[PDB]
Amino acid sequence: EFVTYSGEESSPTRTRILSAALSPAERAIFDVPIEKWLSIDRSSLSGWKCAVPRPVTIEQLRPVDPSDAILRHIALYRGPVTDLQLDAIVNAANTRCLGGGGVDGAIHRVAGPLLLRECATFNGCQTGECRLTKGYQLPARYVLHTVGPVGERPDMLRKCYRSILSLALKNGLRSIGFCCVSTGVYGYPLLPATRIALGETRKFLEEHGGALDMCCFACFQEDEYKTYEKCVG
Ligand SMILES: Nc1ncnc2c1ncn2[C@@H]1O[C@H](COP(=O)(O)OP(=O)(O)O)[C@@H](O)[C@H]1O
């Protein structure tokens, strides 16, 4: 059984979303127990498709240093997080966790409407916490929806990364595709955030050796790439 929230536990909107009719094929996908989604052959569901035409597999990722017993498990990817075929990818969401713009809107677009439907089953997400859902039409199996702080709040951003890494550990997920949380419209300075991102990930990797195969940092913008590229050296 999975741990699907990292914290401790509009309303008409969610009831509305949940009352919409589903096809039998859609209902079948949505009914798959969350713990079983990791290993299922998703093409046994007649209504499933991957909405990304050429996903990026873990064998196509470039470790920063295969020699290093830490950096062999970190990689940088240039492009959108939704491309990565990993156990989970990270969504930079908001309190309501009912979609929106930026990466959040992109992840809901690619995954399809069942993602929103799953998000409507629970009561949003607190800043610093993380919700686990299936990822439907994404090549990735799960989505880890975290809510980043608005503005530079280092303790909150650190919490986001620990919450993500925690649910990955508690549920036996071995790869994670990250996006650069809070550094878009939430206006968290990119360099301090990147240092926190890589910092927590390194710490975790040292404290839980062998727990993760790969932590991929997806850089949607060219500067995001270069920033991470040097912050890892
Ligand atoms: N359409 C998109 N596809 C993929 N990634 C995106 C898209 N839009 C924004 N991002 C990325 O998501 C990360 C967070 O940005 P944003 O979506 O504004 O979230 P936040 O509200 O936490 O800043 C950034 O790295 C940004 O480049």
**What is the structure's resolution, reported in angstroms to one decimal?**
2.0
Atom of ligand 1 nearest to the CA of 220: 27
Closest CA to 157 of 119, 124, 133, 129: 129
Instruction: Write the CA distances from 169 to 6, 59, 104, 185, 194, integer angstroms.
Output: 11, 21, 23, 29, 22
Instruction: Report the atom number in ligand 1 closest to the C-alpha of 105.
Output: 1
**Residue 94 CA, closest ligand 1 atom number:** 21
148 lines ligand 1 (CB under 6 A): yes
How far apart are alpha carbons 118 and 138 in whole angstroms?
14
Specify whether the CB–CB gap between 132 and 171 falls below 8 A.
Answer: yes
Residues whose CB falls within 8 Å of the CB of residue 166, separated by 6 or more in sequence, listed in order: 6, 130
For the Cβ of 177 lying below 6 angstroms from any atom of ligand 1, the answer is no
Residue nearest to atom 17 of ligand 1 (CA): 102
What is the residue whose two structure tokens read 């409407």?
113
User: Domains plus CATH for the chain?
Assistant: 1-233 (3.40.220.10)
Residue numbers in the known binding site for ADP are 103, 180, 182, 184-186, 224
Written as six digits, the tokens of 112 are 């399809």
Q: Contact, 104 vs 126, CB < 8 A?
A: no
Contact of 190 with 148, CB cutoff 8 Å? no
Return d(Cα 172, Cα 212) in angstroms, integer. 9
The CA 45 to ligand 1 mean position distance, Å, reads: 30
Mutate to test the pocket of ligand 1, among 104, 143, 164, 179 (most ligand atoms within 8 A of CB): 179
Map tokens 């995001």 to a residue.
Answer: 224
Q: How far, in whole angstroms, is CA 223 from its chain's centroid?
A: 21
Cα-only R_g, the chain: 17
d(CA 14, CA 167): 24
Task: Please write down the long-range contacts of 11-16, taking CB distance under 8 Å and 24 or more positions apart.
Answer: 13/98, 13/120, 14/98, 14/120, 14/121, 14/123
